């Protein structure tokens, strides 16, 4: 029993991870076969990041420009090219432990693991979840550019983020390994604000299925609710409109606990309209919603990889 | 910026993990050298579990009988042996993967990275903190056992920590990696109960530090007080005693804020006479011990390993 912030093991993207240093910039790199992708902002200066031209940047760039490090070996660069916001560097040497892999775009409400690196190296591993406002809340510093998000589907990895700017209220933006930026933000340093997040509501019930599955009861009712009169309680709490489509992706946590999604429902109704009344969930006094309803099955029943 | 539940990158410890059978019990082993050390009741039935010899059980075993596999790779056993409440499985193959290591034992109130795995497979990683009733809160299932927790140093990984069994109220416990169980605790199925938990009072000031340091400072007074003082008012709320060791340890935290260890006290002390007053702390409303003040140096500074 017991439920907690679980990252995927990253034993798979620690072998993947490089330090790209073009100039004076040092950034961390993800090295797959032969081919070294990076954060497109390693080609700028301090004061380039301002009103950056990546394109006029690259031009006055050579493959030896780009210097790629893995461990205490030097990567040559034979081939640099550029896909939106990151570029491509072609290496003469095929990574060995290159893991099965994928590149994915996760949809807002999704998680993901985060290897923290910082020179190409990994400094630690944490859970995190694409808020719908397409930020990411993170634990990022100066260096951290080039870290990836990902999850794991037995042997494949799935790459599904990429870090590069953090944003005024704390929270940090990125994009896909296809460079193309979460949201309606660019890589220039510049006036940048977030949207109005929102709390994701089937994740807020996954979680409530883990601790029903952990012991905690207490919020249980005997009182069940319709889609729509939960999604009009829901909506004044800058809760995130539940559609049939997460109704049926919290089937299985509600065929395993015996607990309808409706009825679940039905007690998050109770709670956002009263509170906790000093009671607290799996240890917290605040509702959770950075655990998708898969997290919760597979850190519940041991899905391994 | 942003502060998180960070775990030590895995991947030394994803090389080291397999998987022994011993008759019809399956559980994880540690792959070190030419060693495995799992834990010592995979020689057990599940009526063995009740009342066990794991001395007489280990008589009737010979190497044949402990089945180690790496992978798709079976380790032939050629020596066999028990430490406490470990076994040592000494195999003919070397672990090539086997990372720079040591087996240290953990004071209450550290931190250390678990690395949950089943069938040898590793599932997830999390953080964790050694409670002062020598018990760990963690998220195990049952074939978990062997699982391991560990800090890392550069390029040292330090074992600290197997899983062995889960009590009643939720929590876990285990031994280091020679066998020896924290706390009063023994490797069989009967009534056992986890003694009166404190909170790790120098883990909640290095929390406000990180608060601090991420921007979160309406908690911060004009106020100081003394050592003796601030463990008068944190005694009743069942926090462990402030000693100037804690003081200390606190010490590159204060220096790099500027705010004094005992000033950080005087916050405490407030928060805990008066509350949080509706408001939150990096995002929670429950004061958090378990980050130690070098978890919260090595993820604001960005240690790498
Ligand atoms: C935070 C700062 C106000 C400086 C700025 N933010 C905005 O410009 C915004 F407001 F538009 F977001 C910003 O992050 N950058 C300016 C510039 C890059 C980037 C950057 O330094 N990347 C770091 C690389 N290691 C990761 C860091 C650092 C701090 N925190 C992180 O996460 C580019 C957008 C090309
Ligand atoms: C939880 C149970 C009530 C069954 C019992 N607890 C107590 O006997 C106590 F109350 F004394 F703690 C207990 O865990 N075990 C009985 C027996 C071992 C062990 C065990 O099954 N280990 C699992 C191995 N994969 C890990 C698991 C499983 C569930 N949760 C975990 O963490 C041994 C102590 C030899
Ligand atoms: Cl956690
Ligand atoms: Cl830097
Ligand atoms: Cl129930
Ligand atoms: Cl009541
Ligand atoms: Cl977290
Ligand atoms: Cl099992
Ligand atoms: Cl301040
Ligand atoms: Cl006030
Ligand atoms: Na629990
Ligand atoms: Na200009
Ligand atoms: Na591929
Ligand atoms: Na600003
Ligand atoms: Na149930
Ligand atoms: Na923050
Ligand atoms: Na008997
Ligand atoms: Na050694
Ligand atoms: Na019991
Ligand atoms: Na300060």
Same mark, same amino acid.
């Given at each position: 029993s017991g439920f907690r912030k679980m990252a995927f093991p990253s034993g798979k993207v620690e072998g993947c991870m490089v330090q790209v240093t073009c100039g004076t910039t040092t950034l961390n790199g993800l090295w797959l076969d032969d081919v070294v992708y990076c954060? +497109?902002?390693?080609?700028?200066?301090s004061e380039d990041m !301002? $009103?950056?031209?990546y394109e006029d940047l690259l031009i006055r =760039?050579? $493959?030896? $420009?780009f210097l790629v490090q893995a461990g205490n070996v030097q990567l040559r660069v034979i081939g640099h090219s550029m896909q939106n916001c990151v570029l491509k560097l072609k290496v003469d040497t095929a990574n060995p432990?290159?893991? =099965?892999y994928k590149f994915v775009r996760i949809q807002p409400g999704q998680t993901f693991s985060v290897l923290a690196c910082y020179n190409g190296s990994p400094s630690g591993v944490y859970q995190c979840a694409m808020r719908p406002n397409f930020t990411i809340k993170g634990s990022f510093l100066n260096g951290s550019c080039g870290s990836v998000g990902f999850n794991i589907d037995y042997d494949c990895v799935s790459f599904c983020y990429m870090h590069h700017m953090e944003l005024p209220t704390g929270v940090h933006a990125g994009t896909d390994l296809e460079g193309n !930026?979460?949201?309606? !933000?660019? #890589? +220039?340093?510049?006036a940048q604000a977030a949207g109005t997040d929102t709390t994701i509501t089937v994740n807020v019930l996954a979680w409530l299925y883990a601790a029903v599955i952990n012991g #905690? +009861?207490?919020?249980? $009712? +005997?009182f069940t609710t319709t889609l729509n009169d939960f999604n009009l309680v829901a909506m004044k709490y800058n809760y995130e409109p539940l559609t049939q489509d997460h109704v049926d992706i919290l089937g299985p946590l509600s065929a395993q606990t015996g607990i309808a999604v409706l009825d679940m429902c039905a007690s998050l109704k109770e709670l956002l309209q009263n509170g906790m009344n000093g009671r607290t969930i799996l240890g917290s006094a605040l509702l959770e919603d950075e655990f998708t309803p898969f997290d919760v099955v597979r850190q519940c029943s041991g899905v391994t990889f």
């Open positions: 954060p +497109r902002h390693v080609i700028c200066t !301002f $009103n950056p031209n =760039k050579s $493959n030896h $420009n432990k290159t893991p =099965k !930026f979460y949201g309606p !933000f660019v #890589d +220039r340093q510049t #905690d +009861r207490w919020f249980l $009712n +005997r």
